[PDB]
Amino acid sequence: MESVFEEVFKLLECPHLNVRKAAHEALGQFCCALHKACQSCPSEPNTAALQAALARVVPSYMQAVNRERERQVVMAVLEALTGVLRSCGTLTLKPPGRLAELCGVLKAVLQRKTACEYDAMLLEHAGEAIPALAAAAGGDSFAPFFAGFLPLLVCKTKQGCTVAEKSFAVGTLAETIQGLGAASAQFVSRLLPVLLSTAQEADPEVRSNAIFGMGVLAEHGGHPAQEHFPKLLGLLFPLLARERHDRVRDNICGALARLLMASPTRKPEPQVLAALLHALPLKEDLEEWVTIGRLFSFLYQSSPDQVIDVAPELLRICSLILADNKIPPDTKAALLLLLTFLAKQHTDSFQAALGSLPVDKAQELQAVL
Numbered sequence: 001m002e003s004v005f006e007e008v009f010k011l012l013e014c015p016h017l018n019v020r021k022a023a024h025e026a027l028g029q030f031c032c033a034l035h036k037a038c039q040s041c042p043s044e045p046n047t048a049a050l051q052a053a054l055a056r057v058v059p060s061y062m063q064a065v066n067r068e069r070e071r072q073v074v075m076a077v078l079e080a081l082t083g084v085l086r087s088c089g090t091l092t093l094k095p096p097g098r099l100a101e102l103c104g105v106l107k108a109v110l111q112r113k114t115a116c117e118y119d120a121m122l123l124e125h126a127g128e129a130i131p132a133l134a135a136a137a138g139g140d141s142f143a144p145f146f147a148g149f150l151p152l153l154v155c156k157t158k159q160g161c162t163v164a165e166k167s168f169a170v171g172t173l174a175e176t177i178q179g180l181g182a183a184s185a186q187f188v189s190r191l192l193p194v195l196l197s198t199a200q201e202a203d204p205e206v207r208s209n210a211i212f213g214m215g216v217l218a219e220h221g222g223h224p225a226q227e228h229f230p231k232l233l234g235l236l237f238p239l240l241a242r243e244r245h246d247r248v249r250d251n252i253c254g255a256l257a258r259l260l261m262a263s264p265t266r267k268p269e270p271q272v273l274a275a276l277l278h279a280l281p282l283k284e285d286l287e288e289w290v291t292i293g294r295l296f297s298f299l300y301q302s303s304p305d306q307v308i309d310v311a312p313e314l315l316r317i318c319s320l321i322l323a324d325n326k327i328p329p330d331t332k333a334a335l336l337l338l339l340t341f342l343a344k345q346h347t348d349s350f351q352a353a354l355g356s357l358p359v360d361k362a363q364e365l366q367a368v369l
Helices: 001-012 015-037 047-067 070-088 098-109 120-139 143-155 163-198 204-219 226-242 245-260 270-278 287-303 304-308 311-321 329-343 347-353
Strands: none
Touching: 001 015, 001 047, 015 070, 015 226, 047 070, 070 120, 070 311, 070 329, 098 120, 098 143, 120 143, 120 163, 120 311, 143 163, 163 226, 204 226, 204 245, 226 245, 226 304, 245 287, 270 311, 287 304, 287 329, 304 311, 304 329, 311 329, 311 347, 329 347
């Protein structure tokens, strides 16, 4: 299959833009699809083909990022590069120094030090590129290089930058925090100030990504991130009260759920939990239904005697969630788990909890009797 590669490769010297773009993305698609062949028949006379493909396609991507003049070509090269990074994985980072060279390339994007507000979208493609590279390297093998990427992202976050820059910085920082995962425990004392600072910007998206960063940081914060838990609450607890925007509110519920799950000893108290459930149902950012859906399972699994106090709240929420088509079914199931723990154990307290619901909608829930 090296023929198709070597013929679509020389196409990169064409004087036209669309031809170079389509050739780059085509090479990427062939790498990604040739990886999908190494799984059905994992016999290895064609894994050598996959490596013999990435060994020329990936460096062509790096050099293309540095040297190619047209910004759109660099954009599509970063999208396709993120694709090959995500599908294949370690086989991209197999030759020595490959991870370091990729990090250098993305830094070259992040310093405007390339051959080229398209800047927001190019920086965005690098933004997608980074956490995929983290997931490929595996967080542990990526941590020092992330210590490289930290100050460059912190640069685009201070007052004076365009809000597209701020949103890109905090979003990339967050998804990369959950990229490192358990290994992000070492970057708490250096990531936390940035999130605590961008949680106050006058823009909805910047705060919606800041609070989210605080949340995933609290999740994969290993352990030294929970020493800042009374601080994080101190910022989120009042904010949820005053936040007049829907999206930021949704991400605040997700973050509060994440740090509620992140502490299996402290912070199970009913003011935080009650404010969380009271801020429900989610209205605008429906990707966090999975998070609170897991919060329900955590409640039933470890601290179930708390679900008695919030029985009218849980009922008032479950009465609404069932109708929505775009609420994930496993989330509804996670709510019905708690409600079942109320219908048998703590029976009459759940009965009285059914006393505040509209009699019409208090019997749709008893359609599961």
